[PDB]
Amino acid sequence: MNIKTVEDLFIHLLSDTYSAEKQLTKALPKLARATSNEKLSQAFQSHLEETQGQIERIDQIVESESGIKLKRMKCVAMEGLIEEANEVIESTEKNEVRDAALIAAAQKVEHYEIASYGTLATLAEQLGYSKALKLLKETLDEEKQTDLKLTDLAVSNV
Amino acid sequence: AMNIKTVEDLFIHLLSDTYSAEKQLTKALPKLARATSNEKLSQAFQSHLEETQGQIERIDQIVESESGIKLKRMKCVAMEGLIEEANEVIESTEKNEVRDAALIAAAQKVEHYEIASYGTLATLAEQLGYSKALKLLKETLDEEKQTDLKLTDLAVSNV
Ligand SMILES: [Mg+2]
Ligand SMILES: [Mg+2]
Ligand SMILES: [Mg+2]
Ligand SMILES: [Mg+2]
Question: Looking at the 3D structure of chain A, how many domains does it have?
Fold first, then answer.
């Protein structure tokens, strides 16, 4: 993290979010397998497909602006969120308690992303990145809908 | 490490995690308030501290409201990492609007970690029939969403 300008901050956070999404796609298959509820399992599989589209949006964002260039880095916060989900799996039997706990872990993941994309959209707008702003808002709305979905599942987990 | 056999245990685990997260956050907020030269953001950080104080008191009230809600001493590692990131922001920037932007971002990741946690706690409280916890948790949740919104206002106002 070496950041002097708003443009450097945008690149830094976009690079972070990019790493977070790639990590999350690696983890989602196991989350889908670890759940006993098939509706929740399919929500994890749907969320994987959506995350693929979101990573594609980042590529398009990079293409859209000269001097947007991603840095290779590991998003450590996402790394820890994913490990906490894996600790849930390790600490439970495959039942409705695991399900409740996996939804909770995944909503922290989604909320980390909701924050990140909200910030990215604000900064894109500030920097005059019009195409990027459009694409970032598309992801942000999807992240919000996924979280809502997960809440509906947590509530009908009774 | 964690051991969760029942919905009751899960709720205790997460309540305990959140309680640690809030205590850690109060330790961090004073430095965040000093680290910004923008007065409005500085004020938001001091307001957030006083608000978090009241949120910890709600958790004590939640704990008194139901027997067999007993908190476990644990360190919330996610909040620890989010606070570490805010501190790295301070060391990696000059004291200016760029720092402010980056601190607001770090603080919104904190708020959203708490929005998620409280949303889950309110769900499980309802399921468990902890009526008093439910209203307390919903109150904190509402405040957390307002704080995130105030921070968005400041993010956009940093232009
Ligand atoms: Mg995503
Ligand atoms: Mg997501
Ligand atoms: Mg709080
Ligand atoms: Mg908070």
Answer: 1
